[PDB]
Design a protein around this ligand. Structure first.
Ligand SMILES: [Cl-]
Ligand SMILES: [Mg+2]
Length: 323
């Protein structure tokens, strides 16, 4: 393709950069940047966006990013948030639009998650200010079916990364009154724009059990791993007013009780395994696995419950006591 040639020239441009890095020369990504075709609108679909559809394109991204400055990194993120709704890996990771992913589609989703989102997190955590997060957030909000996005694992995680970083800086800055009025106001405007794009569709962040089942079989284990769903719920809740929080917890209340029920079932299985005398190692690894799964369900729900000042503990939801 025209995209494989681009990947080879980008790669060569990388090796060049590395030699100059290694030989103590100043680094210049100008040619690497050009080779990505980030501003190129000649084609139906941008060639850098197209490059993200290839495992190889994905796998060289950390080395590309090693040579970019912050302005270049930001520009790349901006490009990604504009094309999000029709970005392949989003379509691939939505249960709506890809209700039965194959193993290789899954591994692709994981690869993108493992590599691209890791880079995005490092970048935003080491190089970002409130206004840049706001802009990325507005941009996502303006240019996508945000709810559709939330049905995607990558899409949701991208929202959570942005939203938790914003909350974090606002928290670190609040301790000494850094952050202007126009910024706190804009965040509450932007937050409320995000919120209202999700209102009444929040539960659609949880995929159908059927879909969960299909995925469990492909990966060979009994494992809802939905931490990323609860992490999103926690961050969404953390930045809302009481009104926002009551709406949220009301909309996901069936999922809260299904998770509690899931946890209670594992707790019962744990008890009946625990009373058995002189177990074999295989029985004991069965027991350790049930315990771990039980604890993960606790910890994942409690992530969200804690933000509402609640805690699930021993079959009960009670008021979280910090003191
Ligand atoms: Cl630039
Ligand atoms: Mg309302």
């Amino acid at each position: 393709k025209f995209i494989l040639e681009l990947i080879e020239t980008v790669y060569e441009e990388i090796l060049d950069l590395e030699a100059n890095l290694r030989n103590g020369q100043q680094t210049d990504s100008t040619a690497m940047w050009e080779a990505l075709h980030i501003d190129d609108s000649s084609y139906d679909v941008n060639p850098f966006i197209s490059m993200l559809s290839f495992d190889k394109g994905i796998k060289i991204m950390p080395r590309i990013f090693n040579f970019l400055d912050k302005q270049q990194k930001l520009k790349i993120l901006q490009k990604i948030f504009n094309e999000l709704s029709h970005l392949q890996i989003i379509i691939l990771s939505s249960y709506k639009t890809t209700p039965k992913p194959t193993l290789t589609q899954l591994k692709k989703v994981d690869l993108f998650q493992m590599i691209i989102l890791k880079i995005i997190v490092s970048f935003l955590s080491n190089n970002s200010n409130f206004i840049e997060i706001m802009g990325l957030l507005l941009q996502l909000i303006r240019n996508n079916n945000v709810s559709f996005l939330t049905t995607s694992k990558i899409g949701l995680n991208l929202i959570t990364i942005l939203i938790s970083r914003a909350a974090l800086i606002k928290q670190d800055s609040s301790r000494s009154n850094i952050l202007s009025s126009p910024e706190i106001s804009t965040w509450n405007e932007i937050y409320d724009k995000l919120f209202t794009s999700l209102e009444s569709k929040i539960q659609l962040i949880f995929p159908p059990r059927e879909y969960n089942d299909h995925i469990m079989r492909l990966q060979n284990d009994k494992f809802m791993d939905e931490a990323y769903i609860w992490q999103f719920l926690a961050s969404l809740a953390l930045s809302g007013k009481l009104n926002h929080q009551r709406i949220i917890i009301d909309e996901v209340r069936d999922e809260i009780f299904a998770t509690i029920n899931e946890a209670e079932t594992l707790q019962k299985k744990e008890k009946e395994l625990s009373v058995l005398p002189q177990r074999s190692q295989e029985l004991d690894t069965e027991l350790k696995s049930i315990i771990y799964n039980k604890e993960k369900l606790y910890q994942d729900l409690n992530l969200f419950l804690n933000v509402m000042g609640l805690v699930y503990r021993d079959g009960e939801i009670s008021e979280l006591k910090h003191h």
